[PDB]
């Protein structure tokens, strides 16, 4: 389902080379280019004490891959 969505998006985009392409690449498990970020594909949801820890502590955010704004 996620594969179908990202494939359709990559295709009507014109089949360019980018994160749309790289996610499909990693999905077919034959290559990877990890970017220095954390996208929608993997975001654990933090606890309340995690909120009190961050409130603005960026190191815990990058430690536990939480929701960032």
């Amino acid at each position: 389902k996620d594969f179908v969505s990202t494939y359709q998006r990559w295709q009507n985009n014109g089949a360019p080379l980018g994160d749309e392409a790289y996610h499909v690449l990693e999905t077919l498990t034959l290559g990877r280019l990890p970017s220095a970020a954390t996208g929608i594909g993997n975001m654990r949801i933090a606890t309340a004490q995690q909120r009190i820890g961050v409130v603005w502590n960026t190191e815990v955010i990058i430690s536990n891959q939480l929701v960032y704004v």
Binding site: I45, A46, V67, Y68, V69
Partner: peptide, 27 residues
């Protein structure tokens, strides 16, 4: 309220499952 929900989503904030529950409850 709507403005409350905007308040819970300002820059620098991190939401919790209650925010999402309220969002889906708005239907």
């Amino acid at each position: 309220s709507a403005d409350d929900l905007k308040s819970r989503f300002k820059e620098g904030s991190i939401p919790l499952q209650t925010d999402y529950a309220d969002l889906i409850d708005i239907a």
